[PDB]
Symmetry: D2
Subunit: 235 residues, 4 copies
Amino acid sequence: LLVDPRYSTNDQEESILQDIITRFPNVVLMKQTAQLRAMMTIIRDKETPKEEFVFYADRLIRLLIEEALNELPFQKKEVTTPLDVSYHGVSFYSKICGVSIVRAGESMESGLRAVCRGVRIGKILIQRDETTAEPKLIYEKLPADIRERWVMLLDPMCATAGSVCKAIEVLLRLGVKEERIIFVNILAAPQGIERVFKEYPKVRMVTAAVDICLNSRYYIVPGIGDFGDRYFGTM
Amino acid sequence: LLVDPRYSTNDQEESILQDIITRFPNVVLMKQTAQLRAMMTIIRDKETPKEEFVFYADRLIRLLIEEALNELPFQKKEVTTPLDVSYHGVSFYSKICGVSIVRAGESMESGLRAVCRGVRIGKILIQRDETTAEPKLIYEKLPADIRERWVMLLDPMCATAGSVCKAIEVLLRLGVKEERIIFVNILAAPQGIERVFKEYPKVRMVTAAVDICLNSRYYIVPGIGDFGDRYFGTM
Amino acid sequence: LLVDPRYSTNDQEESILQDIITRFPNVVLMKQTAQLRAMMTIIRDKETPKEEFVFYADRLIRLLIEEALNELPFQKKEVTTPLDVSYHGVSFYSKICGVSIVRAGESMESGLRAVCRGVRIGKILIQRDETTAEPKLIYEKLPADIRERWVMLLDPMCATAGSVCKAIEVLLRLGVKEERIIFVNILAAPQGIERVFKEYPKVRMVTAAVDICLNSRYYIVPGIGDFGDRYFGTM
Amino acid sequence: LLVDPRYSTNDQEESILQDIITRFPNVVLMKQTAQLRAMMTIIRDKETPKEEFVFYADRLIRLLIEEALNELPFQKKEVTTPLDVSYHGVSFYSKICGVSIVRAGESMESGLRAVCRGVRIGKILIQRDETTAEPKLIYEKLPADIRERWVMLLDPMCATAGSVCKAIEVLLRLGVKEERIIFVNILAAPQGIERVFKEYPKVRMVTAAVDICLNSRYYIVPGIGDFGDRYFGTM
Ligand SMILES: Nc1nc2c(ncn2[C@@H]2O[C@H](COP(=O)(O)OP(=O)(O)OP(=O)(O)O)[C@@H](O)[C@H]2O)c(=O)[nH]1
Ligand SMILES: Nc1nc2c(ncn2[C@@H]2O[C@H](COP(=O)(O)OP(=O)(O)OP(=O)(O)O)[C@@H](O)[C@H]2O)c(=O)[nH]1
Ligand SMILES: Nc1nc2c(ncn2[C@@H]2O[C@H](COP(=O)(O)OP(=O)(O)OP(=O)(O)O)[C@@H](O)[C@H]2O)c(=O)[nH]1
Ligand SMILES: Nc1nc2c(ncn2[C@@H]2O[C@H](COP(=O)(O)OP(=O)(O)OP(=O)(O)O)[C@@H](O)[C@H]2O)c(=O)[nH]1
C-alpha cells in the first residue's frame, strides 16, 4: 500500500497495490522503500549488464527471503544474557525446505542457502504444452519427507500462474498441506495472483512488486523481461 | 507500537520504545519482526557458540545495513524495460564511505562490503585512559576526501555514547557535515541515544534494538555481553 | 601422481593415480595435499551432517574451479606498478561459460559464479532409460553463442561416463570445438576416465580424485554415495 | 621449483626464487600458475579500480589461506563411506587462531573466516615512531589462550620485516611457541625474508610472491604500492 516519497510511481501503481492488499489477505508486499526501488530499476533496465543484473538480483533475493521466512511459525523462548538477565525472545522450529521451479526459481536457491545453511532443496521442472499449452511436469526431485514440511516455493515471476499452480498441485498430491506453502516471488501480475488464490486460497505469497498487466506473449509489463535468460545469461 | 504480536516484549520495553520514537525524530528503529527477535535471542544467549554467534550477527548486520542505506539521498530515475516500456525508479547517491570504530565496529564492515563492493572504509580507534577513563583518539586512517561524503559510522553497541561522540568530534574536526553522519548501531541504551542527540542533534541513527538501561559496570541490559569479544573470539 | 605423507593411502591409490597420469595426457589431478584429503574425509564420511557436507563440498569446489580455470589460454600482458615499474603478467581468456549436468552438476555453478562474476551458465538434463539404460537428453538450455566459447562442463561424479559423454555429444553437435571443453570433476572411476578419452580424446579433464571401481549399481568405491542427493538433501 | 611457461617472468625473478628456496627451508611458495599470475597482474596494475582490486585480492587471499592451512599438523583418520567401505583420510588440528597486523593484515581476516568459520582473531597495531622510526606496539587484543594455539600471522606485505618481527616478538613474550607461527603473506622482499629468518628461524612463511628489492623509499619493487590504502580505499 505505502509508496515511498523519493521515487515517482508508475501509472495506477498505488491503486493496484492497495487493491491487492485488501482483496488478498494472504499476500504480503515488501515495504516499498527507496532501496528496493533502487535495486528494481537496475534489474529492470534493459541496459543493465549481466554481472550487475545478478549482483543486484542476488541482493534483492536476500531481502525477500528474510521477509518470507517471517511467515513461519514461532515459539516463545527465554534465554539468559552474559549479564545473567533474562531476555524473552523466540525460536524458529519448523521443519522446512525450499522448492524451486526449474531454472528461474533456482536463482533463489543460493539466497535461501545463504541464510539457511543446508536447507533441503527440491526441484520441479515444468514445461507448457506445445499444442494447447497446458503445464506438464517434466521432472522433479523432492525431499522424501516433504509432506511434513513447510515449503518455500521459489519462482521469481508470476504472470499467468500456470506454472506455480501446477507445481502446487503435485506438491499437494504428495501430501503437502496447502496452508504450509509459502510462495516467495519477486515480480507478479494481478491476474496471476487472483488465479493462485482462486485455486489455492490457503497458501501465502510474499512478493516484492506487483506490476500492471501481461502482454499477448504472457510477459509482465512494465515487467523485467525473461528473468531466467537474464540471470543465467542465455539471452 | 508496531511490535510483532507473536512474541512477548521485555518488561517495560514497549514503553521505552515509545519514548524514544517520540522524542528523537532522527532515530530509525528497524521493523521489530519475529524473525529479527529470533536472531537477537540467539546472539544475546550466553550459551551460543562462537560459530553460531558470528553467523547470525553477520546475518542481522546485513539487514541493518540495507535499512541504514535508506537514509541516503536518492535521485529519481527513469529507465526503459526489456518490454520497451518506461519504468520510474530511483538512483543511488554516490559520495559515501564506511567508518568503523576499531574492533567492535569492524565486524560490520563485512556486511557493508557485501552490499557495497569497493566502498571506502575508514578506521578510528578510540580508547579510554586506564586511569582517567576518558576517550582518547589513539589511531585513525580515513579517506582523504571524507569531508565531502556521507559517513556510515559503524559501532554495534551504544552504552554511554562516550566513544561514538568522541568519534563524531574528530570526524567534524576534519570537515564532515553533522547531518551526513548515519550512525548504524545494533543495540543501544536510552541514555546513550539521549547524549548523542544532545550534542549532535543533526546526525541520523539506525538501530535494531533499544534496551532498558545500563548496570553498575556500564553494560547495556538485558544486553548482549561484550560484542567485540564474542565476535572475534577474544573471550 | 604423487601423494602427501601426512595421511595413509588406500590400497593401490599411488598405483592407480600414476597409471591415469601417464596413460592420459589430458587429465589433471589436483595436488594431493593433506588439506584436500581432510576435506574428502568430511564429505565421504556417511556420518557427516548435511550442513557440513555442503560447506566442505562448496569449499573443495572453489579450489577445483580455480585449478580448472588454469587450463584456459593466456596472453602476455605488461602492466605498470604504482611504483612506476613494469611487471610482466598475463591476462586471461575472453570467452567462456559453464555448463552443468542437471542436479549434481548444479552444486558447482555457485563456485563458478563466485570467481567469475556473471558467467553464463548452461544446463543439460540427462536421464537414462529404464530398459536400454541409454542416456537421453531430457532438457537443455544453453547460451546462444556456445559454439565460440570454451565450456567448463560441470559434473561432480564420473562413474560410467555415459552421461558426461552424452553431454559432450550434444555440445559437439551444437558446434563446440571438442578441444575447448574442460570437464571439471570431483570424483572419478578409472573406467569413466578411459571411456571419456576413448570417445573424445581432445577434451581436458580436471579432477580432485580417482577411486578404484564401480559396483553393480554404478557407484564409485570407496566413492561418496549419491552426491546430488547428499548435497541437495533429497536423500 | 616450477614456473608456468605461459608467462614471461621478469629480470632475475627466477634467480631470486632459486636462492630463497635454497637458503630458506621454511618458506612455502605458492605454485606459480598462470591463474595466480593473472591475479597478481590485476592487483599490481596501478590502473585498476578499487572494486576490481578488492575482488581479485580476496580471491587470491582465498587460495593463499588454503595453502597455509596445509602447514598445520594433521592426524590420521578412518571413515566409513556410504558404500560401507573404509577410506583412509586425515583430521584437522584443533587449536588455531588468526592474528592481523592492524589494517593491512585485516584484509586477510575475511578470507580466513571464509574457510574457518568462527576462528578466533587477534589483532596487533604496530606503529613506527614519526621521528625515531622505531616499530612500536600501539594496540593489541589477542585470545586469552593464544599460547596454547598455532597462530596464522597475517600481513600482505614484507619489505624490511620490522613490523612483523615486532609482532612475533610480542607474541613470544606472551607465550606462543615460535615453531607454531605460520606467517601468511602475499608479497615479500628478499631482505624481509632474511631478517625474519635471521631472528626467528623456526617460523613458517607462506607467500604468493617475492619481488626483486626494496625502493629507496623502502617500497617492495616492482611491488604493488600500499596494500592497505588500495584495499580499504584510503589513498
Ligand atoms: N524456520 C527457520 N529456521 C532457520 C532459519 N535460519 C536458520 N534456521 C535453522 O534451520 C533449521 C530448519 O530446519 P531443518 O534443519 O531444515 O530441519 P531438518 O532438515 O529436519 O533437520 P535435520 O534432520 O538435522 O536435517 C532450524 O532448526 C533453525 O534453527 C530461518 O530463517 N527460519
Ligand atoms: N549510495 C549508494 N551507492 C551504492 C549502493 N550499492 C552500491 N552502490 C554504488 O556504489 C557507489 C558509491 O559511491 P562511491 O563508491 O563513494 O563513489 P566514489 O568513491 O567516488 O567512486 P570512485 O571514482 O571510484 O572513487 C555508487 O556509485 C553506486 O553505484 C548503495 O546501497 N548506496
Ligand atoms: N578466462 C578467465 N576469465 C576470468 C576469470 N576470472 C575472471 N575473468 C574475467 O571475466 C571475463 C569472462 O567474461 P565472459 O563472460 O566470457 O564475457 P562474454 O562471454 O563476452 O560476455 P560479455 O561481457 O557480454 O561480453 C574475462 O574477460 C576475464 O577478464 C578466470 O578465472 N578465467
Ligand atoms: N586446523 C583446521 N581446522 C579447521 C579447518 N577448517 C575448519 N576447521 C575446524 O575448526 C576448528 C579450529 O579450532 P578452533 O575452533 O579454533 O578450536 P577452539 O577455539 O579451541 O574450540 P572451541 O573453544 O569450542 O571454540 C577445528 O576443530 C576444525 O574442525 C582448517 O582448514 N584447519
